[PDB]
């Protein structure tokens, strides 16, 4: 029943509500919240803290990584819309308008190249400016739309994606008079969805790498402090808590420490 | 209290207006809205021109 | 007062003959004014 | 934040519910269903709500037109499919296909009125062609000629498009059963998609002209009530509510009346 070492019921309710509403609050990042780590602290001051806050943070970083890997939204729907706009429109208009069918999208081929996106967005800037105007003066708009009333809203949406990659929204387009007739989808929505997709994946890899590095650090500190005790259940707790972890293994390790919770609580002084 | 200091600082930044003019209705209504701005990089001149055109709108006999 | 460029291609009957990339250039004085006599007092505030 | 008049806490929720889930209910005509416009009343007879319901219905029509212009999807996709069928299949049959007509008549009958066609006689010519390919001579049911098993469903689909042009689906020309082959399926798809396109655009322009007419109607009443008093907040509310409006002005004007909400609320008596 999400067992925590030595805490108040208020602080246990804080941590349980935090992990239940992790997807809902903005700025999903454990380093941004001081009150969570300061509510993870144990009573009776630094003598208790120096051995038990290490294990308490060691529970909290693991459960953070666990609900992180559990509550991941599927990012393939938005890449499916990218391939829809891409494959349906941007290839077929090049074939119709005889632009020799340049295959930069077929150069990506995949959502494995989080790189090689920005050059394709610059080529899409050149395409959008070409189809809106025959001057082809290469210009420096951030978005091909030339619409500046919603560029600020799109940047707000991308910063909201950076803060909460667990819960995101996608910003559609207007129609009073369109610059690109149907191509505002491929030209503008393709740039926006591409930046959105690569930004969500970079934020995801960032948080997951930070969570794993902090878990390895808490393992090193916690085993360094429990190295001293030579009792039988003490070295049993050493063998439980010394096990090296990769992100794939953390779910089984949480299932380990749920069962071994009763004896390592006794093994702690 | 800090908000009153912001209002007064913006009042002195606009023109150095005297409190006697701060009591004027056009000022009394717009100083609070000029408080929720000018903390940004916007300008000092824009507020002078805004006060000009608003004071002008006010006085249409 | 702002200067504005105008890039425009011609009417399509003149766009035809290897003139597709032509791009007329028109400078249009946005929000300025014509002037006909040398301004003396307000020389600080007026650019020719 | 979602501005409304001297109005209660239940009707705010009902208005925001309707304006949020505008896309899912059928018959989106705010004129036609009176459950909302009669609901946005201030109450207490006539004296304590005439000018206030006037302002509140002004906000209601304005944000209805706002969420219309923000939520209408792109119809140029269905016109892109019209151009694909019309260009690729039928022209190649008429010229490359053989024994059909001549260059100037057919190719320009398809090519003419790319932008803004409401033409029924061109449609009738293609229906006469496909009817000549089919079994019978008259032009009774021409859209999916030689089969009436889908006629009620497709008329229902067009009526549902007239009701909710914001959420539209394209039914389909079925594959295994057909009077003739690829040609007659292309023609039936072409005529249905043309009727769908002109239906969506005419219903949209109808609703947009309705909303603009209602907003410009309520402005004159609001100005006639607010003109008399000579206070500064009064005349500032007069000028803010006498700014001229167009359909591409309404978004910025909603953002303006958001910040100016706190002064006109006191300016109302």
Draw up the topology in text.
The structure is cut from a larger assembly and holds 2 copies of chain A (269 residues), 1 copy of chain B (61 residues) and 1 copy of chain C (48 residues).
Chain A: H1 9-20, H2 34-39, H3 45-70, H4 76-96, H5 105-108, H6 118-132, H7 151-163, H8 183-226, H9 232-241, H10 250-259, H11 261-267
Helix pairs in contact in A: 3-8, 4-8, 6-8, 7-8, 8-9
Chain B: H1 2-14, H2 19-22, H3 25-35, H4 45-58
Helix pairs in contact in B: 1-3, 3-4
Chain C: E1 2-8, H1 12-15, E2 24-30
Antiparallel strand pairs in C: 1-2
PDB class: virus
Keywords: beta-herpesvirus, HHV-6B, murine cytomegalovirus, human cytomegalovirus, pp150, pU11, pUL32, pM32, pU14, virus
Entry title: Atomic structure of the Human Herpesvirus 6B Capsid and Capsid-Associated Tegument Complexes
Structure, described:
This is part of a larger assembly, with 2 copies of chain A (269 residues), 1 copy of chain B (61 residues) and 1 copy of chain C (48 residues). Chain A has 269 residues and is mainly α. Chain A contains 11 helices and no strands. In chain A, helix 6 runs antiparallel to helix 8. Chain C is built from 1 helix and 2 strands. In chain C, strands 1-2 form a two-stranded antiparallel ribbon. Chains in contact: A-C, A-D, B-D. Chains B and D meet through helix 3 of B and helix 8 of D. Chain C: Belongs to the herpesviridae major capsid protein family. Chain C: It is found in: Virion; Host nucleus.
SSE series of chain A: HHHHHHHHHHH
The helix count of chain C comes to: 1
Strand element count of chain C: 2
Helicity level of chain C:
under 10%
Largest interface: A-D, 12 and 15 residues
Distance between the termini of chain A: 23 Å
Oligomeric status of the shown chains? part of a larger assembly
The secondary-structure class of chain C comes to mainly beta
Total E-strand runs of chain A: 0
Largest sheet of chain C: 2 strands, antiparallel
Number of helices of chain A: 11
Helix content of chain A: 55-70%
Subcellular location (chains A, D): Virion tegument
Family (chains A, D): Belongs to the herpesviridae large structural phosphoprotein family.
Protein name (chains A, D): Large structural phosphoprotein
Subunit structure (chains A, D): Homotetramer. Interacts with the major capsid protein. 180 tegument protein pU11 tetramers bind to the virion capsid.
């Amino acid at each position: 029943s999400i067992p925590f070492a030595w805490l108040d019921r208020d602080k246990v309710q804080r941590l349980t509500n935090f992990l239940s509403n992790l997807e809902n609050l903005e700025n999903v990042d454990l380093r941004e919240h001081p009150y969570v780590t300061n509510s993870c602290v144990v009573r009776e001051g630094e003598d208790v803290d120096e051995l038990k806050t290490l294990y308490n943070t060691f529970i909290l970083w693991l459960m953070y990584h666990y609900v992180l890997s559990k509550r991941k939204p599927d990012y393939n729907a938005i890449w499916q819309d990218i391939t829809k706009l891409q494959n349906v429109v941007n290839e077929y208009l090049k074939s119709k308008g005889l632009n020799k069918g340049n295959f930069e999208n077929m150069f990506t081929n995949k959502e494995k190249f989080e790189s090689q996106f920005s050059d394709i967005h610059r080529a899409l800037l050149r395409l959008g400016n070409s189809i809106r105007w025959g001057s082809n003066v290469p210009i420096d708009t951030p978005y091909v739309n030339l619409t500046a009333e919603d560029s600020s809203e799109i940047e707000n949406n991308l910063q909201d994606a950076e803060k909460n990659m667990l819960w995101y929204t996608v910003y559609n387009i207007n129609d009073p008079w369109d610059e690109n007739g149907y191509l505002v989808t491929s030209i503008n929505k393709l740039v926006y969805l591409g930046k959105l997709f690569v930004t969500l994946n970079q934020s995801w890899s960032k948080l997951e790498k930070v969570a794993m590095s902090q878990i390895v650090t808490t393992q090193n500190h916690l085993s360094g402090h429990l190295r001293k005790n030579e009792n039988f259940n003490a070295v049993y707790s050493q063998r439980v808590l010394q096990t090296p972890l990769t992100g794939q293994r953390v779910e089984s390790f949480l299932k380990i420490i749920t069962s071994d919770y009763e004896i390592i609580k006794s093994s702690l002084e | 209290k800090e908000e009153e200091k912001k209002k007064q600082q913006m009042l002195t930044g606009v023109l150095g207006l005297q409190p006697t003019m701060a009591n004027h209705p056009v000022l009394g209504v717009f100083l609070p809205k000029y408080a929720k701005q000018n903390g940004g990089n916007v300008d000092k001149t824009a507020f002078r021109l805004d006060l000009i055109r608003m004071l002008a709108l006010h006085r249409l006999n | 007062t702002k200067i504005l460029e105008v890039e425009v291609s011609l009417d399509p009957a003149q766009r035809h003959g290897n003139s597709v990339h032509f791009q007329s250039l028109q400078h249009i004085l946005y929000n300025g004014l014509c002037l006909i006599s040398p301004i003396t007092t307000l020389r600080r505030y007026y650019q020719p």
